[PDB]
Amino acid sequence: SNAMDQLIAKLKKLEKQNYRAYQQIKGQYNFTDFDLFIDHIQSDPYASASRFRAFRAWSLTGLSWLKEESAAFQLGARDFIARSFAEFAKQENAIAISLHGQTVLDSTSVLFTEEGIELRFRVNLPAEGRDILAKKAINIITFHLPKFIRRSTIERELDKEALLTHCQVVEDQEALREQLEVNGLVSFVANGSILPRVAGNCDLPMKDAVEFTAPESLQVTLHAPNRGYVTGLGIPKGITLIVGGGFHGKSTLLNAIERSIYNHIPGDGREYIVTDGSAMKIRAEEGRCVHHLNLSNYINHLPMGKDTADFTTQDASGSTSQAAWLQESVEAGASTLLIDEDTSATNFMIRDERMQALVAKGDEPITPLVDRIGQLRDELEISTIIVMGGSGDYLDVADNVIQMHDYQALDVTEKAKEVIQLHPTEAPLVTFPPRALHCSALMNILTDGKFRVSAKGKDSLRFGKEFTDLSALEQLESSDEVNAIGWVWYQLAQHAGWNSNPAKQISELLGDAWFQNMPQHGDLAKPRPIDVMAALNRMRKSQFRNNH
Amino acid sequence: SNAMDQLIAKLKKLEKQNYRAYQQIKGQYNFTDFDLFIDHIQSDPYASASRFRAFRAWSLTGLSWLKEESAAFQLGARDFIARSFAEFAKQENAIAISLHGQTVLDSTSVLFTEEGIELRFRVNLPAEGRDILAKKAINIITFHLPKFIRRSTIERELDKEALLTHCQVVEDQEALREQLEVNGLVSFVANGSILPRVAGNCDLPMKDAVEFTAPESLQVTLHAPNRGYVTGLGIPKGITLIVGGGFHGKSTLLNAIERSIYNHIPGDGREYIVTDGSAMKIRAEEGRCVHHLNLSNYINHLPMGKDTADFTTQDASGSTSQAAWLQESVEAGASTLLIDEDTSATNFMIRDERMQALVAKGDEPITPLVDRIGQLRDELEISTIIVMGGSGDYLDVADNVIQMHDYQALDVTEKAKEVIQLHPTEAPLVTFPPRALHCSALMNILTDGKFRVSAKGKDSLRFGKEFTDLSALEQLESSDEVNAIGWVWYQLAQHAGWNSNPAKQISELLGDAWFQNMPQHGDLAKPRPIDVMAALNRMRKSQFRNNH
Ligand SMILES: Nc1ncnc2c1ncn2[C@@H]1O[C@H](COP(=O)(O)OP(=O)(O)NP(=O)(O)O)[C@@H](O)[C@H]1O
Ligand SMILES: Nc1ncnc2c1ncn2[C@@H]1O[C@H](COP(=O)(O)OP(=O)(O)NP(=O)(O)O)[C@@H](O)[C@H]1O
Ligand code: NA
Ligand code: NA
Q: How many CB atoms lie within 10 A of CB A71?
A: 11
Instruction: Give me the helix-helix angle, A529-537 and A479-492, nearest 10°.
Output: 80
Question: What is the chain B residue with the closest CA to A306?
Answer: B247
* Residue A528 φ/ψ, nearest 5 degrees: -75, 145
Using a 10 angstrom Cβ sphere, with 0-12 exposed, 13-18 middle and 19 or more buried, the burial of residue B481 is buried
Counted domains in chain A: 3
Atom from ligand 2 closest to the CA of residue B250: 22
CA distance B336 to B260: 13
B408's enclosing H/E stretch is strand B408-411
What are the distances in angstroms from CA A387 to CA A249, A394, B391? 10, 11, 18
Q: Which positions in chain A touch B465 (Cβ < 8 Å)?
A: none
Domain check: are A478 and A384 in the same one? no
CB B134 within 8 A of CB B11: yes
B401's enclosing H/E stretch is strand B400-405
Domain check: are A332 and A444 in the same one? no
B185's enclosing H/E stretch is strand B185-190
Closest CA to A376 of A293, A301, A282: A282
- Residue A470 CA to ligand 2 center (angstroms) comes to 22
CA distance B332 to B325: 11
Domain check: are B386 and B448 in the same one? no
Domain check: are A414 and A446 in the same one? no
CB B341 within 8 A of CB A348: no
Q: Which positions in chain A touch B246 (Cβ < 8 Å)?
A: 299, 317-320, 347, 366
Q: Is residue B22 part of a domain?
A: yes
CB A380 within 8 A of CB A331: no
Domain check: are A367 and A452 in the same one? no
A529: Cα within 13 Å, side-chain hemisphere: 21
| Count of helices and strands (H, E) across chain B | 15, 30
DSSP for B317-329?
-HHHHHHHHHHHH
Question: C-alpha angle A333/A493/A544, rounded to 5°?
Answer: 50
User: Does residue A385 have its Cβ closer than 6 Å to ligand 1?
Assistant: no
Question: C-alpha angle B441/B444/B447, rounded to 5°?
Answer: 155
Nearest ligand to the C-alpha atom of residue B281: 2
What is the amino acid identity at position B57? A
Domain check: are A407 and A313 in the same one? yes
Closest CA to B363 of A456, A69, A406: A406
Task: Indicate the residue among A395, A422, A449 that finishes a domain.
Answer: A422
> Strand order in A280-281's β-sheet?
A280-281, A336-340, A383-387, A239-243, A400-405, A408-411
Terminal-residue alpha carbon distance, chain B: 65
Q: Using alpha carbons only, how large is chain B's radius of gyration in Å?
A: 26
Q: Is residue B303 part of a domain?
A: yes
Task: Indicate the residue among A121, A137, A158 that finishes a domain.
Answer: A158
DSSP for A349-417?
H---HHHHHHS-SS-PPP--HHHHHHHHHHHH--EEEEE-SS--GGGGT-SEEEEEETTEEEE-HHHHH
- Residue A338 CA to ligand 3 center (angstroms) comes to 16
CA distance B5 to B26: 16
Which pairing describes strands A263-264 and A103-104: parallel, antiparallel, or unpaired? antiparallel
Nearest ligand to the C-alpha atom of residue B286: 1
Domain check: are A355 and A447 in the same one? no
CB B233 within 8 A of CB B409: yes
Closest CA to A437 of A321, A546, A314: A546
Q: Is residue A405 part of a domain?
A: yes
Domain check: are A305 and A408 in the same one? yes
* B484 Cβ neighbours under 8 A, 6+ residues apart: B514, B518, B524, B525, B526, B527
What are the distances in angstroms from CA B292 to CA A16, B434, B540? 58, 11, 12
* A270 φ/ψ sector (left φ>0, alpha ψ -120 to 50, else beta): alpha
CA distance A284 to A282: 7
Closest CA to A115 of A190, A56, A185: A56
> Strand order in B544-545's β-sheet?
B498-499, B436-438, B544-545
In terms of C-beta distances under 8 Å and separation of at least 24 residues, what long-range contacts does B210-213 make, across chains too?
B210/B406, B210/B407, B210/B408, B212/B408, B212/B409, B213/B408, B213/B409
Q: Which positions in chain A touch B288 (Cβ < 8 Å)?
A: 200
Alpha helices in A434-542 (DSSP H): 441-448, 479-492, 502-509, 529-537
What are the distances in angstroms from CA B358 to CA A242, A365, A420, B355, B370? 12, 30, 10, 6, 22
CA distance A512 to A531: 17
Which pairing describes strands A498-499 and B290-293: parallel, antiparallel, or unpaired? unpaired
What are the distances in angstroms from CA B26 to CA A272, B46, B47, B518? 60, 19, 17, 20
Q: Which of A244, A347, A353 sits opposite B359 (nearest CB)?
A: A244
CA distance B37 to A401: 68
Q: Is residue B199 part of a domain?
A: no
CA distance A459 to B201: 14
CB A406 within 8 A of CB A260: no
The conformation of residue B216, written as its DSSP 8-state character, comes to G
* Residue A7 φ/ψ, nearest 5 degrees: -65, -45
Closest CA to A542 of A471, A466, A472, A461: A466
CA distance B315 to B288: 5
Question: C-alpha angle A73/A75/A78, rounded to 5°?
Answer: 110
Q: How many CB atoms lie within 10 A of CB B112?
A: 18
Q: Which of A130, A198, A318 sits opposite B343 (nearest CB)?
A: A318
Q: Is residue A199 part of a domain?
A: no
DSSP for A217-256?
GGEEEEEETTTEEEEEEEEESSEEEEE-STTSSHHHHHHH
Q: Is residue B201 part of a domain?
A: no
* Residue A523 φ/ψ, nearest 5 degrees: -115, 60
Closest CA to B387 of B342, B326, B340, B338: B340
Q: How many CB atoms lie within 10 A of CB A312?
A: 13
CB A249 within 8 A of CB A407: yes
Chain breaks in chain B (C to N over 2.5 A) after: 425
- Reduce the DSSP state of residue B507 to 3 states and report it: helix
Q: Which positions in chain B touch A303 (Cβ < 8 Å)?
A: 247-248, 405-407
Q: Is residue A133 part of a domain?
A: yes
> Strand order in B228-236's β-sheet?
B219-224, B228-236, B185-190, B273-275
Q: Which of A22, A43, A210, A247 to mutate to test the interface with B (most CBs of B within 10 A)?
A: A247
Q: Using alpha carbons only, how large is chain A's radius of gyration in Å?
A: 26
CA distance B285 to B470: 10
Which pairing describes strands A498-499 and A219-224: parallel, antiparallel, or unpaired? unpaired
Using a 10 angstrom Cβ sphere, with 0-12 exposed, 13-18 middle and 19 or more buried, the burial of residue A271 is buried
* A401 φ/ψ sector (left φ>0, alpha ψ -120 to 50, else beta): beta
Domain check: are A309 and A378 in the same one? yes
Q: Which positions in chain A touch B129 (Cβ < 8 Å)?
A: 18-20, 130
CA distance A149 to A377: 51
* Residue A131 φ/ψ, nearest 5 degrees: -75, 135
Which pairing describes strands A383-387 and B280-281: parallel, antiparallel, or unpaired? unpaired
* A541 Cβ neighbours under 8 A, 6+ residues apart: A441, A445, A466
Which pairing describes strands A116-123 and A127-128: parallel, antiparallel, or unpaired? unpaired
Name the minimum distance, in Å, from the CA of B373 to any CA of chain A: 18
Closest CA to A266 of A33, A490, A80, A30: A80
B120's enclosing H/E stretch is strand B116-123
> Strand order in A219-224's β-sheet?
A219-224, A228-236, A185-190, A273-275
For ligand 2, atom 31, name the residue with the nearest CA.
B196
- Reduce the DSSP state of residue B503 to 3 states and report it: helix
Q: Is residue A284 part of a domain?
A: yes
What are the distances in angstroms from CA B280 to CA B283, B381, B409? 10, 15, 23
* A132 φ/ψ sector (left φ>0, alpha ψ -120 to 50, else beta): beta
Instruction: Give me the helix-helix angle, A71-88 and A160-178, nearest 10°.
Output: 140
Which pairing describes strands B498-499 and B436-438: parallel, antiparallel, or unpaired? antiparallel
For ligand 1, atom 25, name the residue with the nearest CA.
A251
Name the minimum distance, in Å, from the CA of B152 to any CA of chain A: 32
Chain-centroid distance, C-alpha B345: 24
Domain check: are B293 and B372 in the same one? yes
CA distance A503 to A509: 10
What are the distances in angstroms from CA B382 to CA B259, B447, B508? 19, 40, 23
User: Does residue A389 have its Cβ closer than 6 Å to ligand 1?
Assistant: yes
Which pairing describes strands B116-123 and B110-112: parallel, antiparallel, or unpaired? antiparallel
CA distance B476 to A107: 38
Q: Which residues line ligand 2 (CB under 6 A)?
A: A 313, 315, 317-319; B 195-196, 206, 209-210, 246-252, 340, 342, 387, 389, 404, 407
CA distance A336 to A238: 9
A545's enclosing H/E stretch is strand A544-545
Closest CA to A104 of A319, A284, A266, A274: A266
* Residue B354 φ/ψ, nearest 5 degrees: -50, -60
Closest CA to A137 of A239, A34, A41: A41
CB B235 within 8 A of CB B187: yes
For residue A408, give its domain range. 280-422
The conformation of residue B107, written as its DSSP 8-state character, comes to B
CA distance A98 to A523: 6
Q: Which of A288, A317, A339, A342 to mutate to test the interface with B (most CBs of B within 10 A)?
A: A342
Domain check: are A389 and A453 in the same one? no
CB A370 within 8 A of CB A397: yes
DSSP for A157-204?
GS-HHHHHHHHHHHHHHHHHHHTTTTTTEEEEEETT----EEETTEEE
Using a 10 angstrom Cβ sphere, with 0-12 exposed, 13-18 middle and 19 or more buried, the burial of residue A93 is exposed
CB A270 within 8 A of CB A264: yes
CA distance A523 to A455: 11
* Residue B438 φ/ψ, nearest 5 degrees: -85, 80
What are the distances in angstroms from CA B303 to CA A207, A358, A404, B116, B132? 18, 41, 11, 61, 65
Atom from ligand 1 closest to the CA of residue B314: 29
What are the distances in angstroms from CA B338 to CA A108, B238, B397? 47, 12, 16
What is the amino acid identity at position A373? I
CA distance B4 to B25: 12
Length of chain A: 548
CA distance B520 to A148: 47
The conformation of residue A4, written as its DSSP 8-state character, comes to H
Chain-centroid distance, C-alpha B334: 14
For ligand 1, atom 22, name the residue with the nearest CA.
A250
* B363 Cβ neighbours under 8 A, 6+ residues apart: A244, A245, A248, A405, B301, B303
Domain check: are A82 and A123 in the same one? yes
CA distance A367 to A399: 21
Q: Which of B243, B287, B347 sits opposite A201 (nearest CB)?
A: B287
Bridge partners, A37 (sequence order): A28, A53
Cα dihedral B139, B141, B146, B149, rounded to 10, equals 130
Q: How many CB atoms lie within 10 A of CB B494?
A: 11
* A102 φ/ψ sector (left φ>0, alpha ψ -120 to 50, else beta): alpha
CA distance A196 to A203: 9
Q: Which positions in chain A touch B363 (Cβ < 8 Å)?
A: 244-245, 248, 405
Q: Which of A246, A359, A406 sits opposite B347 (nearest CB)?
A: A246
Length of chain B: 548
CB B252 within 8 A of CB B275: no
Using a 10 angstrom Cβ sphere, with 0-12 exposed, 13-18 middle and 19 or more buried, the burial of residue A415 is middle
CB A483 within 8 A of CB A535: no
User: Does residue A246 have its Cβ closer than 6 Å to ligand 1?
Assistant: yes
Q: Which of B287, B390, B407 sits opposite A352 (nearest CB)?
A: B390
Question: C-alpha angle A179/A185/A186, rounded to 5°?
Answer: 100
